[PDB]
Design a protein around this nucleic acid. Sequence first.
DNA 1: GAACCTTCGAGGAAG
DNA 2: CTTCCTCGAAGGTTC
Lengths: 48, 313, 309, 312, 312, 312, 312
Amino acid sequence: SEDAEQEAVAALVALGYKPQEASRMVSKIARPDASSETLIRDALRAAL
Amino acid sequence: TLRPQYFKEYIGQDKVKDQLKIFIEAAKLRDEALDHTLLFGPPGLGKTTMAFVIANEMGVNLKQTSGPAIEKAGDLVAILNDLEPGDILFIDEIHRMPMAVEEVLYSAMEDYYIDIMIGAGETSRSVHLDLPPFTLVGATTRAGMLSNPLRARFGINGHMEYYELPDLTEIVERTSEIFEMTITPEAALELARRSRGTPRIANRLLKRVRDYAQIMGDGVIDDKIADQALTMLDVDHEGLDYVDQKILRTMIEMYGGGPVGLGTLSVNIAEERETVEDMYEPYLIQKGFIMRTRTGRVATAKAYEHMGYDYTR
Amino acid sequence: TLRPQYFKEYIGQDKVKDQLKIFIEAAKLRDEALDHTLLFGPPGLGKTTMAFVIANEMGVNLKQTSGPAIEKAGDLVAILNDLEPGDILFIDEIHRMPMAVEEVLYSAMEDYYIDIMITSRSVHLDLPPFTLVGATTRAGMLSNPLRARFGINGHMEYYELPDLTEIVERTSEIFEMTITPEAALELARRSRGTPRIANRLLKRVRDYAQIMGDGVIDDKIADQALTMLDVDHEGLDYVDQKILRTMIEMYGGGPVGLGTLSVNIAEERETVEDMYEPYLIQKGFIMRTRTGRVATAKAYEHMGYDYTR
Amino acid sequence: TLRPQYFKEYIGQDKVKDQLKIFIEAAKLRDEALDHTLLFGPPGLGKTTMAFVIANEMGVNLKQTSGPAIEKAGDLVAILNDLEPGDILFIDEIHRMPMAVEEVLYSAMEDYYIDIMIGAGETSRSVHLDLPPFTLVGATTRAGMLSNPLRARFGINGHMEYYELPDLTEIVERTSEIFEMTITPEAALELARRSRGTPRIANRLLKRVRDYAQIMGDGVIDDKIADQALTMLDVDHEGLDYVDQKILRTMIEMYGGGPVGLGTLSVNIAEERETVEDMYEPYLIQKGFIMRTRTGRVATAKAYEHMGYDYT
Amino acid sequence: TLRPQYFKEYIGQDKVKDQLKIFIEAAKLRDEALDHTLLFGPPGLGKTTMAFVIANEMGVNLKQTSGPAIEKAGDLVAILNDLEPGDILFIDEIHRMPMAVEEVLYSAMEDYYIDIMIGAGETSRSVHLDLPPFTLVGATTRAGMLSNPLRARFGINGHMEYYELPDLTEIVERTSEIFEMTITPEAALELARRSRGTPRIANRLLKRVRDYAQIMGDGVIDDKIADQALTMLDVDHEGLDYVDQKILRTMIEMYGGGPVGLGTLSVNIAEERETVEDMYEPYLIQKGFIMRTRTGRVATAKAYEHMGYDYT
Amino acid sequence: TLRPQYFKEYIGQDKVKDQLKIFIEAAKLRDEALDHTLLFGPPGLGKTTMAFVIANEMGVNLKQTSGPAIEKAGDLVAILNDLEPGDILFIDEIHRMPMAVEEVLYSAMEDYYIDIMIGAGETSRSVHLDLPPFTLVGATTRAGMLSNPLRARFGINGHMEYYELPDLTEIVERTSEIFEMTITPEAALELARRSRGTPRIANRLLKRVRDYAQIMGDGVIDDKIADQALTMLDVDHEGLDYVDQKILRTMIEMYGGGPVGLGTLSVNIAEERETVEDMYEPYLIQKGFIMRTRTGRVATAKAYEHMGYDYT
Amino acid sequence: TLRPQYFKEYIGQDKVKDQLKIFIEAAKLRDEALDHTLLFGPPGLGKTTMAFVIANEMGVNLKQTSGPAIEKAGDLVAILNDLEPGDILFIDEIHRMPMAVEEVLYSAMEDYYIDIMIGAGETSRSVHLDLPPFTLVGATTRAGMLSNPLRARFGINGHMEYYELPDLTEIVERTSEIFEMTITPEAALELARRSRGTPRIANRLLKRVRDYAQIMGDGVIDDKIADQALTMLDVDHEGLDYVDQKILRTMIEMYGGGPVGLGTLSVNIAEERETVEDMYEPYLIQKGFIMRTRTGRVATAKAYEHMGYDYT
DNA sequence: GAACCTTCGAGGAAG
DNA sequence: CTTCCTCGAAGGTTC
Ligand SMILES: Nc1ncnc2c1ncn2[C@@H]1O[C@H](COP(=O)(O)OP(=O)(O)OP(O)(O)=S)[C@@H](O)[C@H]1O
Ligand SMILES: Nc1ncnc2c1ncn2[C@@H]1O[C@H](COP(=O)(O)OP(=O)(O)O)[C@@H](O)[C@H]1O
Ligand SMILES: Nc1ncnc2c1ncn2[C@@H]1O[C@H](COP(=O)(O)OP(=O)(O)O)[C@@H](O)[C@H]1O
Ligand SMILES: [Mg+2]
Ligand SMILES: [Mg+2]
Ligand SMILES: [Mg+2]
């Protein structure tokens, strides 16, 4: 799942978020099995 | 009503109101959202209130934000997930958005999905984010600064206009009922004529007249009291202030209509250059009382017959 | 004290004073707060003084700050958080606030609440009913959205000879100086219509009467003191007289350019245009023309020369 | 998609289209890249679409950016470094990129290399980087505002022009089939006349007329329905928009045809002076409705008779 | 390649070549660099090429930049720190350099030193830079637009002039010799006659005619084929461009031949004054199509008889 | 010392000096600080000198700073709050303070308080800082550059005038005793008449004459040495420089007294238009040698009798 | 070297040399620093050269900087902190300093102190910096841009004059000795007459003639070689250029000597209105070839005989 | 009516 | 974002 986690974190960074904050934001997600899309979507939804 | 919910209740703007009705009904006769819309016009006409009415007519929820509040692409994308299928997003002062986000904004508008690119550039991969259908409603005052690609996405254009006396008079009447005061229709017509076509000005005059009518009178705004109140304040029957009358009189009496420079006129009325050019001069041009020329300001024949002076070329 | 405390002490400004009384009485009768008031006009006419009178008549405690002190939105948010129901907030030189602060202020004026971002954190505030009062000399420099939120506009005007005569007498009693009725009128004519200038002349005459006289101002001492200061009976200064004299005797009344006139009197171009000409034009001693400026018939009669068209 | 993909599907622009065919096939016979090409003309004439057609006829992948999108040399260096042999690069409003960006383009276009200095103080060196063969495609609205030394680098100039009634009527028909709309040859002609020569306007008008016909009619676009719809949309029979009618009406009624200055006019109508002179005045000038004079704009006799006012 | 690299290859400009030969040769007996040289004249005549030739004759490296590319004094200081002994620095459009930048050159060109403030805060200090020997080459379209202190420091001046019919004919033959192509003497003469005495135009036209001869002909250029190709393009039988036809047509039809102000003409045709003053007007004057007078420009009878109008 | 320290030593300026005496004496009888004073006028007449004299007569310490040194409100807020009761603050070149800083003095001058933001972040607060009684003294050459609300707060205004020959003679004699030189009263009058009415010029002439008298003479200044030294400097008995004399001669010998334009005259003397209008023309007009008219400059009869010509 | 090192080497400027000698000798006897001095006048006459001569005669180290190299008061303060007692500070082209910095010199020049703001910002105070004795030397091409209070502080003013044929002839000879060339006295006189009285021009011509004489000649600049070399440079025997000759020719051939207006003439010569008035007309008037009049300019008899036409 | 000269007013670009 | 300044206009005299 490290690929999806890194992809989601990298994609969040590509939107201009800081590496630290993006890592924390994604680190706040619990479910590892969910796809990067659900992770980034949940991350952004939780960050709203 | 002052706060409307349907086109049946919104006062004025009959032109834009009639057009939007047809487009909304044609959209309902299909499983489609309303086309991206752009609203134009001077400030203070009700562009924001119009958005709430469109949302209620569509039977959908409204999300609201402003151009300056969007600093990075992540801000917009986060808001886009909040939109349910058919939701309306209203962006005020859309012309203030940053160029970096403009690329993302029109892309999602056209495709309803976003592609994200990551990697060093030599090796890169994409991810596809599907979005529900939605309608973007933009409001702006300055259009010449919108980019051509952005302009091309908006399929509906609406122009707001200054309210006319028959419509502006009803706003006074309805507002006069929120307070506890009776007003005669002849008095309401006199206030509307001096409101420069702007609802916010009509409310300010009504509030000032209310104070006089309940301290120097019987608490009723009759035609006799309205004339007295409008005489304590120096607002002319055309809406010219005391300073506006002094400006026109000075140009005709001392300079024979001009040309006269901005600096020369300022020192005669004892005002700053920036005050005459931005407070008083703008409205006098709209009414056609003066013109701006390479050699200075000049008074028109319309000003002579309003002030009551004979005219000669 | 120098500053009047109540409308009964406030002399002149019949237009603005009469209107504000109506609005204050109506607001009290309804137990509501007064609408936001903007005061603007020439320097020294009474804008700052009137702001304190409005507070004393309403019976509220005045909070005072100035535009140059508020440098960031955090400063204004902190100030607004201390307002209590019915309080009055007075901001002097309101034209100096940064544009980032104006956008925050004009929202609070309409809805009485704030929802703004300020390591950053969000802040939300609900404000009680309050009245904002602003004073400025450059009202055109404010943003058009902000001007639209003020509900009352007070434009100040110059005072007349009877009003300035009474002001001089009032100030003389504070200094415990004796002044005659006809002596006060001689100072009023020279004060150009401004209370601050009238008070300044009295201070300079008092010093002379104490050193070159018996400490009493009379029609005789006033002539000597005013002759030392060299202020004409029309209020023209030494340099003002030199300008008119030069135009009448060297250029036959004009037209003459600003540069030519400045070099002939040994003055800087910007000093003549911004410090001496404004009063001469408003009183009708000089007129500006497409080819220069010319002295009017009023100037010939005052200086004592035979007029020729 | 609505836009065409090949010269057979692209209607009009016969001159530009005929010239490009010869050069494109000649380049293939020699097996070399096409020379740098500049496209210019009024907005919406199809400049962007033509770039895609050229890419398909060449057999290359298009890359895209815009002048306002490039703000520093490092951007263009990265963009140009992100190029494949034979690639076609399209730059929108190439005249709007800053003067600092053109520095890279001159050596890139003529010699296909760039030079970047490195080091500080007593240390100073530079890197010279070769670029593979590529074809730049530029587009602008104004040719005279392009950089003179840059303009000299373009090898082909494609001047776009307004479409005529035969072409626009065929374009309207083409689009109508995608919407499954029934339109007669008469109604299609009315839209073509009033769309004043611009395909983008014709497509937008068609969608708006469809919404009216689906309610105020039986879904059949008749000539009578098209005329009623066009008046509801406030479109003049000459193709003058709401703003165009407002300008001419104000000059005639408030200034007797002028002369009037741009500032005064732009203050009378709630518009920016930069917008009036850039968006609206150019069309009104080409049709002779407004004339420019030493004292300002003046409405000609043609304008008086069109609006329905007796000329002096 | 196309660009010449030695004086034996550089055709024309005999007056400039004759002088530069003497000074370049004299500068080699002594062990010193060549004096600062200023080249000026119409655009596209080959002054940039001359800088490469001088560098190849001197046997040194050539660095290139432009006035518009330098924005602040620190930019120019960095460039001067990157010059090796004897290097040549070429600045194009030198007349457009900002005044804050230009005044740095007054010491560098005459004494080879610069006074600079370095550091910040308490570390701020003044340093006296000493530059190695070098030769500055400037190019400008308007020699009369340089400041008096700058122009006084250039030691050599070279005015450049339009090429004559025999010279362009050889340039066409040379260019058609680098490419594997065959051109008849009559076709080469006609193609040169169209090229406005400007080599850049001649090279661009030949390239396009070559494409046409390979697809619409037998791969050989003949007057019949050249006329067809030159007629498919907008090149008039006497070289007038479409931009030129618009100018003459607008002056004759909308101003009745004038006199008309160049400013009002420029805005009516929507063209940059600088382009018409530097690129178009000079040729129309040197060929008798446009006359001039204190009141303004005037269209001569030759223009009326060319455009097909009546010289009423 | 070279600057007078008390009213007994300060020669001339009777109007300003007479007024200041009365106001200083009256202030002492009331045991309170002097009102705010502004000194303005032409360069070199004694503005900076008078500021120190006021402090010596008041018997208090002077705190000195300048307009160019103050750049932000924190600086002025730091200079204030460091004042003691009865202190005098002197700001030279007060006309170049930033406008955002001038508005801080509006409260301090009228009511002796300042609105100060105190703390940081959530601790930020607004408090009234309060100042002791103090006297602000300002000096400037460009009084028209101050804001109207600031000038209205100064309670005393001192406008400086030019000195007369008797006063300048006494000044020269006094200075001749700061150095060690014997000077004849006849020679002192000769220098004073050539000093254009300004004390700084009178001291400058004396220094130059001293150098000559001790190198080319016996070390004493007498009518014989004064004539020789003044002949070397080439200063006419009316104070006209070499260029001043050249201007009058050219107007009388070529144009018969004028009218003549400034541009035409500048080129005839090899001077540039901006130096003549700023350095030389001012004194010639103020002393009546030249007259400006709508048609140009004209030489007056006084110039003819000075140069020795006939006023035909 | 090319630049004279001492007053014994400096030819010409007798009026300036004589005064400077007396002031320098008097300064040494008193063991004091020399008063501040300002050098001004036309370009290329020797202002920068004189600034070094003064330093060598005083026997002190010279600190050098440039007007445009100072951007803020922080720079000037750092420079003044480096001065040692008796140091000379030379500021070239002092007229380019910003006004905000120019006003800091007022205190430094008169009293050798500066007011400065120091501290972190929370704690800060004003302090005096006290400078050692020093001499400021300034050179400027146009003093009219300096403010009146600054010019009044310079104690010694030096106005440079043009050189005459006797003095300029020696400069040509001296320069030939440095180049180790041989020049005939008659040839040296020929170059001086064509140098417009300016040493920089005389040196430039000699370099070009020297290069020619050693490439196509026998290494001697005789009267015969000079004529051939000067004919190649296209410099008339009076220093007129082809443009200058074209003007005088046009005025005679098309106007019979005038009077003619500048606007009319500009069109007949294809020259820019303002360029002709500023670039070429000044020298022609000063030499008497053209004369300005109320109705226009007229070519004098001198212009006729020089061109070979028949005077009438 | 052609040419010189002075004065004013509104842009714009360099702090 | 603001101050300085430069470009264009037109009124007036004279031959
Ligand atoms: N009297 C002289 N004798 C010999 N050479 C001289 C003399 N005066 C000037 N020169 C030379 O003339 C050239 C230019 O002199 P400069 O002093 O640089 O002119 P300039 O006054 O600096 O011009 P600027 O700084 O641009 S105003 C140098 O080569 C000097 O050596
Ligand atoms: N000749 C044409 N044939 C088919 N469609 C066209 C043609 N010209 C324009 N269009 C259509 O109108 C729009 C033109 O947009 P675009 O080509 O981007 O305009 P421009 O690039 O000129 O600004 C597109 O939707 C395009 O499909
Ligand atoms: N004398 C010449 N011989 C051969 N080619 C020439 C000659 N002069 C110019 N050219 C060609 O024409 C173009 C001239 O461009 P360039 O030298 O940059 O002109 P400019 O310097 O005036 O812009 C080049 O492509 C060059 O090869
Ligand atoms: Mg106040
Ligand atoms: Mg001083
Ligand atoms: Mg020099």
